[PDB]
Amino acid sequence: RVRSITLGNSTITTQECANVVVGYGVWPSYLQDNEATAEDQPTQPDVATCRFYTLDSIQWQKESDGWWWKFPEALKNMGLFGQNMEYHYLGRSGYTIHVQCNASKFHQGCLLVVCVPEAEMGCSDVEREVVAASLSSEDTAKSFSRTESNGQHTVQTVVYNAGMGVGVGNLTIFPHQWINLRTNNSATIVMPYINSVPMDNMFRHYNFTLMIIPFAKLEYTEQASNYVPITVTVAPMCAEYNGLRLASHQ
Amino acid sequence: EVQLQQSGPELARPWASVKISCQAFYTFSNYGMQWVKQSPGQGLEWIGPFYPGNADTSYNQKFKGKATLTADKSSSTAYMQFSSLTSEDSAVYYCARVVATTDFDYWGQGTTVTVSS
Amino acid sequence: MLTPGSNQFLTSDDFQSPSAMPQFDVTPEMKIPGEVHNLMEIAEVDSVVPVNNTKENINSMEAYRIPVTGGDQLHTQVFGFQMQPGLNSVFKRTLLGEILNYYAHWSGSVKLTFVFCGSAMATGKFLLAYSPPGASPPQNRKQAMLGTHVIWDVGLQSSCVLCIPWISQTHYRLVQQDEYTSAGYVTCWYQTGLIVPPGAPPSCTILCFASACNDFSVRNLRDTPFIEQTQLLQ
Amino acid sequence: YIEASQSPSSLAVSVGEKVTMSCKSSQSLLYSSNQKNYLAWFQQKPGQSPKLLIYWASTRESGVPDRFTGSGSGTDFTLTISSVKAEDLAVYYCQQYYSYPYTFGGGTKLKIKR
Amino acid sequence: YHSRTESSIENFLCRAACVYIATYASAGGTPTERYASWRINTRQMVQLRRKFELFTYLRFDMEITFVITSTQDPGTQLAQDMPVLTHQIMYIPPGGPVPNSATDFAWQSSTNPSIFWTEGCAPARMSVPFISIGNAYSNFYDGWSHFTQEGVYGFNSLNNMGHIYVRHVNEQSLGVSTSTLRVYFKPKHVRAWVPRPPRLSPYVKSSNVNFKPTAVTTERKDINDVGTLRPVGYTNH
């Protein structure tokens, strides 16, 4: 029984009935007048944000290692969201992530999808410091590595340390899901706003990192497709931005 | 300081089974008997232990499936059987006995098992 | 009135101290989601356990995968390990292990979940076995059959849950004490093999997760052994 | 298989000079419950029955002179003879009785320097 | 049923742990000797750093206790009858003036709370409240401090706790008296959010999360090899 969701009235989407992770248990919601530093009331643009911003499709192969995007920068050029990031100073939002693989029953594998909040990345050379380009490209996917990378200004892309310094087997403590091609084929994760101040600039701060890591490598016979595509969808929810009007009566 | 005896040194033949007994001058209470072999070089090598008072049997993997152990506590004589003997087994076969759980205090006399092809 | 023991500084005292900055109105707290109230909330979540750390996979992802292959293997053992968290090299690095190492006394039961990360058309059986603390591990499939066992059918069921209980004379057992042949062993054996239809992969991989039940308590906080370095940084 | 490694060279020294020899039992020989070392040194008169000299790695044997002193903990173990003698010719071995199999050392003959 | 009181956040993060051992002279020497300074942070003690970094956001007070022990110094012209010694303990909140040497004007600023402690009593204590602009200290910060998207990466954010300075009030004409300061730090009323996996690689920087690629666990003999590390005994002969 396929189900068709048309958020934004300009985007089509078909998905089956599945389980949904709600992040840390809280549903995303607008900021109320209780926990706000500014008495100036922020505006809430949601007419064009609430649509499915289908990212590019990546190719899971037999020798791949992992991938990871940095939000909210991943939607830097996606339509009206990029316009809002450019035209406003302070902004706040939660997200809804759909990840789907399209593989027949003769393939096999297992993926881990996590959303790590405040992911600080280590450097490839211990003494130096990372640069802005190595943390994330605009809307593509950065890749991990099997072997130590010996770069000079790049992050540490070793897969079994996640670039953070923790064991990759202990990332299940974060909001996560498993895509097991034997029985399961999709993942849905709802992520609220997690930060120490009610609003913050989108360009200077990376709210969180989406990580996809294959634990069991893809396998197939000689006569089969050489890859399994992975497709990512985001749907911003509960967006707010500061107000640009004169609070003082004039 | 208690002395220790055995069957004795005899000149054997190929594929002629050699029964080396080991006499007893102690009890059979949780103590152990074993052998090692004195080759021309590299000293000693363990062949297999037997623990009277525990009914425990064990063999070295260098002799596994090739040597067997039989023991008679009542008669004070216990056998160390072997067959398919080669010409490279000729060594001084020492019988050691231990009144302890983990120790190797006492030692034997020796038997010469040289053969003639 | 006062003993000379009244004027002392005891490092484990809980008394009110004079405020350095009175009349300072602190920032009100907001509702950041995901608050934790107790570290036992952390050890109850699943973590992937490196069961395959044979000295060449500890520096790779391969340590997490248990290899299963189909063929002439009649009763060869898939895997086996001793069930002693906090000290065993299999468990001491996961969430449960690194929470336990901060403590010196632990009590409760453990949970293991095996997930068959294989093809969707592969059929077979597996015989999980559990041996209590007062027993030697099995060596033949028949021996593991006559103890406590569960038969896992990888065609009908894709995941298996095994709950290891708490058996001990005393309430709290020390974390750092190696109980030789007194902790219990878990072993898995081939039962039928692995059957695949034409044109499908002939090998698979069985991941394992280990976590805590609701029954733990911990006691006697201490310092972890994993932080060998002690100097002040820089 | 537990392995032990004797010193590459024998004594090759004059009579009556203090000598130090060592056995490296790779696999650990210290027991948690007892804090015992299951390693004993042996002397083998060529043609006669060999006998151990220092057992438990801390105790001199009964009937053994005071010149032989064996110590050590962990994987390494060491032995000292305060003054070597010429009539005490043997091949010194180190034997571990921690776990099966029972492995002997490498040997160390009392060679000739005179 | 077994209680879980011993594992709660308070009982896990309210242990008083020594964070700084310093020494300072009294009369003779260059100006940098005569005072002892320390910036309050939890990124230099590896054990405390690991325990704090187990979480992401924290909110707590600070109780600080000073164990000051003084002694005489060998040399020439030793005093025989100095009455007592007194120490000034100064807390400098963020945005406060900082002394650059002993006998500076900043030691008399009325905005910096000071403790005058005379030796022989119980050690001095103070309790600093939650001093910050934001609503929680954040251990891990992903981003840049300046909105131009360049600067120090993930550091020197809006979280600070100030500095602490100690000096000898007693000007001493004859002899030099050394003193040693030990600072004990303890959080109170701790609130923690967003748990994290504990770290694996050795710590290398007091400001970065830089590291070396380390293994995931300890090696093992075989995939299906149980321990069996019990020697020969009465059981298992």
Author numbering:
A (entry chain 2): 81 to 330
B (entry chain H): 2 to 118
C (entry chain 3): 5 to 238
D (entry chain L): 1 to 114
E (entry chain 1): 56 to 292
Question: Which passages does the manuscript contain on this structure?
Answer:
Echovirus 3 (E3), a serotype of human enterovirus B (HEV-B), causes severe diseases in infants. Here, we determined the structures of E3 with a monoclonal antibody (MAb) 6D10 by cryo-EM to comprehensively understand the specificities and the immunological characteristic of this serotype. The results of our cryo-EM studies revealed 6D10 bound to three different types of E3 particles, the mature full (F-) particle, the intermediate altered (A-) particle, and the procapsid empty (E-) particle, resulting in three different maps with 2.8-, 3.2-, and 3.2-Å resolutions, respectively. According to the structure of the complex, the 6D10 attaches itself to the viral surface along the edges of the pentameric building blocks of the virus and adjacent to the twofold axes, a binding location similar to that of our recently reported antibody MAb 5G3.
More interestingly, we obtained two distinctive conformations for the E-particle with an additional round of 3D classification, named E-upright and E-sideling. The differences in the position of the binding of 6D10 seem to have given rise to the two conformers. Although the overall mode of the binding of the 6D10 to the E-upright and E-sideling particles at the C-terminus of VP1 and the EF loop of VP3 was comparable to those observed for the F- and A-particles, the 6D10 shifted and moved away from the twofold axes while binding to the E-sideling, which may have been caused by the flexible nature of the C-terminus of VP1, resulting in the rearrangement of the structural elements. Notably, two units of 6D10 bound the E-particle near the icosahedral twofold axes, which was different from other HEV-Bs, indicating that the E-particle was more immunogenic than the other two particles and could possibly serve as a promising candidate for the development of a vaccine. Importantly, our structures of E-particles bound with 6D10 revealed for the first time the nature of the C-terminus of VP1 for HEV-Bs at the structural level, which to date remains unidentified for most picornavirus due to its flexible nature and largely disordered properties. Our structural studies further underscore the importance of the VP1 C-terminus of the E-particle in the pathogenesis of the virus.
